[PDB]
RNA sequence: UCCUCCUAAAGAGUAACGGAGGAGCACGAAGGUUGGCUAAUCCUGGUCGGACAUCAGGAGGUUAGUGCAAUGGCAUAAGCC
RNA sequence: GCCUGGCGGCCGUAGCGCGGUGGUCCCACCUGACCCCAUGCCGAACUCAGAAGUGAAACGCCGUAGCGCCGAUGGUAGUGUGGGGUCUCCCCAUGCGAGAGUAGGGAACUGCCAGGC
C-alpha cells in the first residue's frame, strides 16, 4: 500500500507549522467515499445489470443493494417499490488501493477539470467529482470494456473546517477551482 | 445634602400600611450596610416637596431616626396608579 | 376599524373586571393620555375621540392607540322571534381603568397643552388627564 | 349551537391521599391519562392501561417531591 | 457523547430494575478495564465488587481488557457473592449487547456460583 | 343511546339552542416478545432526469410518527424495522 | 486531605458566558481484526485483540458574583371572617399573603464501593 505509506508521512505534516501549533491529534482524515451507479429502469432482464454491477463491486468491499425510491407516486410513472440505485460504497483498505491507481494511471478516460469553480461550506470538506460514468478502473479484466454505466462519487473528511479538507484533498489532485 | 427626621414604625403589614396612609405620612425602609432592615414612617407631603430635586435619588442624604443619624442612598420606589404620590420607598445604607 | 383579523373564536363571555390594572406608564411615545375613570370603552368611542384629537394636533405626526379591543359583541332583533342563538357582531369593546393610557405620541405640537391632550380633547365618555414619559 | 351532547360518564379523580396503605390491595387513585406527572417507586407499578397505583409487595405511601427536574414520586416503603 | 443509543438501552434497564427492586449486577467495560458490582436489595449499597483494577486479580494479567480476564471478574464477583450467600441476581448489562466479554463474564460467573 | 374537553369554583357533582367535536368499528395484522434504530425543516452538492427523481454533510429538533373526536400518553417507545 | 471511575442520591447553589487544567492513575481517541459474533451489503454498528501515537475532540475539575437560579425586610396584587358606606368599589376591625424586584444567598452537597497519590 505505497499510497497509504505516503499519506502517513508527507500529507498534512506541515499544517499550522508556520504558527504557534504543536497538536498531533488534530490532523484531518478520510476513510470512506460515497458511491452510486445507474441501474436504469429495466427490472425484468436482470442479467445485463448484474454483470456490470459485479464488475464494479469487484473493487469494493460491498455487494450491490436493491434500493427503493423516496418519491414515486403522482409524478414519475412508478410506485413505492421501484429500484433506484445500488450504492456499493468504498471504505478502508480498498480506498487507499483505489488511490494507488487514481492519478497514477486512472486518468485517460475522465474529463479534465477545466472551468471548475466548486466550494465547500459545512466544515467537512464535502466535494463531488462529477465524473458521471464509471472510469473502467484497470485492475485485471478491463480490456473487454467499451460500454459504461452512469456513476456518482463524493468525498467527505473527519475535520473541523473545510480549510483542512482543502489541504488533505489536494494530495489527490482535485483543483477545487480551475 | 438633605436631612430629614423619621420615626421607627410601631406596626407593619397591609392593615397598618393602610392606617399609615392617612394623608399625613407614608412607609419607607433603610436596609443593607451590614446592619438590620429598619422600617420607618416619613412625611407624606414635606418629603414629596423635598424629592422634587434629583439629588434625592442620585446623591447621599441623611435620615435622623431614634436620635441617630444614618447616611443613605436611594434604591427603589412605589407610587399611586394614577397620581404622582408616594406609596412606599427603599433606601440602602451608604 | 379596530378589528382583529382571522380569529379562532368570536363567541366570548361579557363578564366583570376589577377595574384597577397597573400604574400609568408609556411605551410607544414620550407623551400620553390617561383615562382617570373606570369601565368599558367602544371602538366607535375610540375612533370618535381619535377623530377629535387628530384635529387638536391639526396635521402633526401620528397618534398611536394604547387600547385595542379584540373582543366582539353581538346584537340580534326580536323579530325571528328570539332564542335562536347570538346574531351578528355590532360593536368591539376594551377595558378602561384610571391609570390606563389610551393614546401615545412623540411628534407632538409646539402649543402642546394649550391645544391637544390637556385641552381640545373631545367625544370622550369620561374626563381624561395628560401624562409624561417621566425620568424618575 | 345545541344541544351540546357534552358527555356525562366518570370523573377520573384522586382518591388515595396523605399517608396511605392497603390491607390486601393497595391501589391509591385510579386516574386516566396520568403517566408523566407523578411516577411510581418501590413495590408499586402501573403505566398500562390499568390507571392504578397497584403494589406487588407490602408497604405504605409517603409521597416525594424530590427528583430529576420535573419528576416527583409516589414512593412506597415497608415499615 | 457518541453513546446516545447505549444510554437509551441502559435507561430501559434502570427503570425496569427499579420496578423489580432487589439486586443489580452493574456490569461495565472499557477497552482497558472490566467492572462488576452487586447492588444490595435496597438498590443503594454495594455488597460485593470485582474489577480489573483490583491488584488481587489484575496483576497476574497480560491485558486488563481480555476475555479471559472478563471471565476472571465473573469468577471473582460470583465467589464473593457466594461467600455472602446471594442468588437470583438481576443481570444489569448497562445498555451493552449480550455477547463477547459481557457474555463470558456471565458464563464464567454462572459456573463459579452466581445466580442469575 | 355511546365518547372527550371547557364554562365548572387551587376534590367531585354543578344550569343555559352556554362554548365545540366525535361513535354504533376495524387490524390475523397495525397482536405477542426479543434484538437494532428514530424524526421535522432549511441550506449545500452531483450523472443516466424534460422543471424536480440520487442522498452525503452541515444548521437543527424530542416543533417527526401513532385508527379517528378532544384530552393526555408514547423514543425505556405504543413510532420504523 | 487530594484525584478519578461505577451505581447512583440530591437534581439550577448543580445553568450560561469566558479562561485555566490532567495522562503515575483512570478515560477517550488511537493500533489492528482470525475465531465465537454481525451485515436486505459492510469489523459502518455490534464485537474481539491490545499499546506504537496523544491530551486535541471526548471525559472530569476549577476560577469568575456579569446574567440565570434561590431571594430577607418593607410595600403591592389577592383573600378568610366581621361593621358600615359614598356599592361588583371604598372606609374600618382582625388575620392570611403571592407574582416581580431589592439587600442577602449562590459558581452545590452527598451515600456505597473501587482504583490512584
Edge to edge, the sheet with strand D73-77 lists D39-41, D73-77, D60-61
Residue range of the domain that includes B9? 1-94
Structure resolution, Å: 12.0
Q: Who contacts C109 (Cβ-Cβ below 8 Å, separation ≥6)?
A: C57, C58, C60, C115, C116
CATH code where residue B23 lies: 2.40.240.10
SS3 E98: coil
B16 touches strand G (CB under 7 A): yes
SS3 E71: helix
Residue range of the domain that includes A94? 3-172
Using the Cβ of D17 and the Cβ atoms of chain E, whether some distance falls under 8 Å is answered with: no
Bond prior to A55 in cis (omega within 30° of 0) = no
Pick the residue from chain C with its C-alpha nearest to B54.
C136
Domain ranges of chain C: 21-136
Task: Report H helices in chain A.
Answer: 2-7, 47-57, 93-98, 162-168
Which residues are C105's β-sheet partners? C31
**Closest residue by Cα to residue B45 from B16, B23, B21, B18:** B23
Residue D40 is inside which H or E element, if any? strand D39-41
Q: Residue A131 CA to nucleotide G67 C1', Å?
A: 54
Question: C-alpha distances in angstroms, A13 versus A22, A158, C58, E4, E108?
Answer: 11, 16, 77, 34, 48
The CATH superfamily holding the domain C21-136 is Ribosomal protein L16/L10 (3.90.1170.10)
Residues 86-145 of A with CB under 7 A from strand F: 87, 118-124, 126, 128, 130, 132-133
Q: Residue A157 CA to nucleotide F57 C1', Å?
A: 10
Touch of B by C (3+ CB pairs closer than 8 Å): yes
Classify residue D64 by burial, with Cβ atoms within 10 Å: 0-12, 13-18, 19+: middle
Q: What technique was this entry resolved by? A: cryo-EM
- Residues from chain E that touch D40, judged by Cβ atoms under 8 A, are 19
Q: How many domains does chain E have?
A: 1
Q: How many domains does chain A have?
A: 1
Characterize the bridge pairing of strands B3-8 and B61-65: parallel
**Closest residue by Cα to residue C32 from C129, C98, C110, C136:** C129
- Residues from chain C that touch B57, judged by Cβ atoms under 8 A, are 136
Residues 40-69 of D with CB under 8 A from E: 40-43, 45, 57
Cell of residue E70, nine digits: 472478563
Query: Which nucleotide's C1' atom has the smallest distance to the CA of E64?
Result: G50
Q: Who contacts E98 (Cβ-Cβ below 8 Å, separation ≥6)?
A: E106
Q: Who contacts A157 (Cβ-Cβ below 8 Å, separation ≥6)?
A: A28, A29, A30, A124, A125, A164, A165, A168, A169
CATH code where residue E58 lies: 3.30.420.100
Whether A56 maps to a domain, the answer reads: yes
CA angle (C109, C113, C114) in 5-degree steps: 90
- What's the gap in Å between the CA of C90 and the closest CA on chain B? 32
- Residues from chain D that touch E21, judged by Cβ atoms under 8 A, are 42-43, 57
End-to-end alpha-carbon separation of chain C, Å?
Answer: 36
A60 touches strand F (CB under 7 A): no
Place of cell 323579530: C79
- What's the gap in Å between the CA of C85 and the closest CA on chain B? 41
B88 touches strand G (CB under 7 A): yes
Contact check, Cβ <8 Å, E21/D43 = yes
Q: How many whole angstroms separate alpha carbon E95 and alpha carbon E97?
A: 7
Bond prior to A66 in cis (omega within 30° of 0) = no
Query: Do E64 and E58 touch, CB atoms closer than 8 A?
Result: yes
Q: How many domains does chain B have?
A: 1
Contact check, Cβ <8 Å, E21/D57 = yes
**Closest residue by Cα to residue E102 from E77, E81, E71, E62:** E71
Whether A91 maps to a domain, the answer reads: yes
Whether A178 maps to a domain, the answer reads: no
Q: How many whole angstroms separate alpha carbon C128 and alpha carbon C101?
A: 10
Q: How many whole angstroms separate alpha carbon C121 and alpha carbon A123?
A: 64
Contact check, Cβ <8 Å, E21/D45 = no
Contact check, Cβ <8 Å, E21/D42 = yes
The number of beta carbons lying within 10 Å of the beta carbon of residue E110 is 14
CA angle (C29, C34, C40) in 5-degree steps: 120
CATH code where residue A30 lies: 3.30.1440.10
Q: How many whole angstroms separate alpha carbon C112 and alpha carbon D2?
A: 56
- What's the gap in Å between the CA of C63 and the closest CA on chain B? 21
Optimal mutation site among B77, B82, B87, interface C, most CBs of chain C within 10 A: B82
Contact check, Cβ <8 Å, B82/C36 = yes
Amino acid at each position: 500500500a505505497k499510497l497509504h505509506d505516503y499519506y502517513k508521512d508527507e500529507v498534512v505534516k506541515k499544517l499550522m507549522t508556520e504558527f504557534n501549533y504543536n497538536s498531533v491529534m488534530q490532523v484531518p482524515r478520510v476513510e470512506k467515499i460515497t458511491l452510486n451507479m445507474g441501474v436504469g429502469e429495466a427490472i425484468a432482464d436482470k442479467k445485463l445489470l448484474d454483470n456490470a454491477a459485479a464488475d464494479l463491486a469487484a473493487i469494493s468491499g460491498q455487494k450491490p443493494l436493491i434500493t427503493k425510491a423516496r418519491k414515486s407516486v403522482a409524478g414519475f410513472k412508478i410506485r413505492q417499490g421501484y429500484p433506484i440505485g445500488c450504492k456499493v460504497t468504498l471504505r478502508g483498505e480498498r480506498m487507499w488501493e483505489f488511490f494507488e491507481r487514481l492519478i497514477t494511471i486512472a486518468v485517460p478516460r475522465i474529463r479534465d477539470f477545466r472551468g471548475l469553480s466548486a466550494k465547500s461550506f459545512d466544515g467537512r470538506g464535502n466535494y463531488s467529482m462529477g465524473v458521471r460514468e464509471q472510469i473502467i478502473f484497470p485492475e485485471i479484466d478491463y480490456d473487454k470494456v467499451d460500454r459504461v454505466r452512469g456513476l456518482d462519487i463524493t468525498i467527505t473528511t473527519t475535520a473541523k473546517s473545510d480549510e483542512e479538507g482543502r489541504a488533505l484533498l489536494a494530495a489527490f489532485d482535485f483543483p477545487f477551482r480551475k | 445634602m438633605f436631612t430629614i427626621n423619621a420615626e421607627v414604625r410601631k406596626e407593619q403589614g397591609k392593615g397598618a400600611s393602610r392606617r399609615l396612609r392617612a394623608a399625613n405620612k407614608f412607609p419607607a425602609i433603610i436596609y443593607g450596610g451590614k446592619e438590620a432592615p429598619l422600617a420607618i414612617e416619613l412625611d407624606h407631603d414635606k418629603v414629596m416637596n423635598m424629592q422634587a430635586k434629583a439629588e434625592f435619588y442620585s446623591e447621599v442624604l441623611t435620615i435622623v431616626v431614634d436620635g441617630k443619624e444614618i447616611k443613605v442612598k436611594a434604591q427603589d420606589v412605589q407610587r399611586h396608579p394614577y397620581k404622582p404620590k408616594l406609596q412606599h420607598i427603599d433606601f440602602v445604607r451608604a | 376599524m379596530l378589528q382583529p383579523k382571522r380569529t379562532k373564536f368570536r363567541k366570548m363571555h361579557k363578564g366583570r373586571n376589577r377595574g384597577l390594572a397597573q400604574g400609568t406608564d408609556v411605551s410607544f411615545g414620550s407623551f400620553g393620555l390617561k383615562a382617570v375613570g373606570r369601565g368599558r370603552l367602544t371602538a366607535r368611542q375610540i375612533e370618535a375621540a381619535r377623530r377629535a384629537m387628530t384635529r387638536a394636533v391639526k396635521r402633526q405626526g401620528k397618534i398611536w392607540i394604547r387600547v385595542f379591543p379584540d373582543k366582539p359583541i353581538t346584537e340580534k332583533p326580536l323579530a325571528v322571534r328570539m332564542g335562536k342563538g347570538k346574531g351578528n357582531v355590532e360593536y368591539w369593546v376594551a377595558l378602561i381603568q384610571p391609570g390606563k393610557v389610551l393614546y401615545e405620541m412623540d411628534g407632538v405640537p409646539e402649543e402642546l397643552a394649550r391645544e391637544a391632550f390637556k385641552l381640545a380633547a373631545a367625544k370622550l365618555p369620561i374626563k381624561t388627564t395628560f401624562v409624561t414619559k417621566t425620568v424618575m | 349551537g345545541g344541544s351540546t351532547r357534552n358527555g356525562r360518564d366518570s370523573e377520573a379523580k384522586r382518591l388515595g391521599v396523605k399517608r396511605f396503605g392497603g390491607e390486601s390491595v393497595l391501589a391509591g387513585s385510579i386516574i386516566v391519562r396520568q403517566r408523566g406527572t407523578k411516577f411510581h417507586a418501590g413495590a408499586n407499578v402501573g403505566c398500562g392501561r390499568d390507571h392504578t397505583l397497584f403494589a406487588k409487595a407490602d408497604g405504605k405511601v409517603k409521597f416525594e417531591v424530590k427528583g430529576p427536574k420535573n419528576r416527583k414520586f409516589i414512593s412506597i416503603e415497608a415499615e | 457523547d457518541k453513546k446516545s443509543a447505549r444510554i437509551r438501552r441502559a435507561t430501559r434497564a434502570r427503570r425496569k430494575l427499579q420496578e423489580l427492586g432487589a439486586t443489580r449486577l452493574v456490569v461495565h467495560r472499557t477497552p482497558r478495564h472490566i467492572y462488576a458490582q452487586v447492588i444490595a436489595p435496597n438498590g443503594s449499597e454495594v455488597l460485593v465488587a470485582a474489577s480489573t483494577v483490583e491488584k488481587a486479580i489484575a496483576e497476574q494479567l497480560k491485558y486488563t481488557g481480555n476475555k479471559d480476564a472478563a471471565a476472571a471478574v465473573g469468577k471473582a464477583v460470583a465467589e464473593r457473592a457466594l461467600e455472602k450467600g446471594i442468588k437470583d441476581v438481576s443481570f444489569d448489562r448497562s445498555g451493552f449487547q449480550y455477547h463477547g466479554r459481557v457474555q463470558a463474564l456471565a458464563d464464567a460467573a454462572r459456573e463459579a456460583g452466581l445466580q442469575f
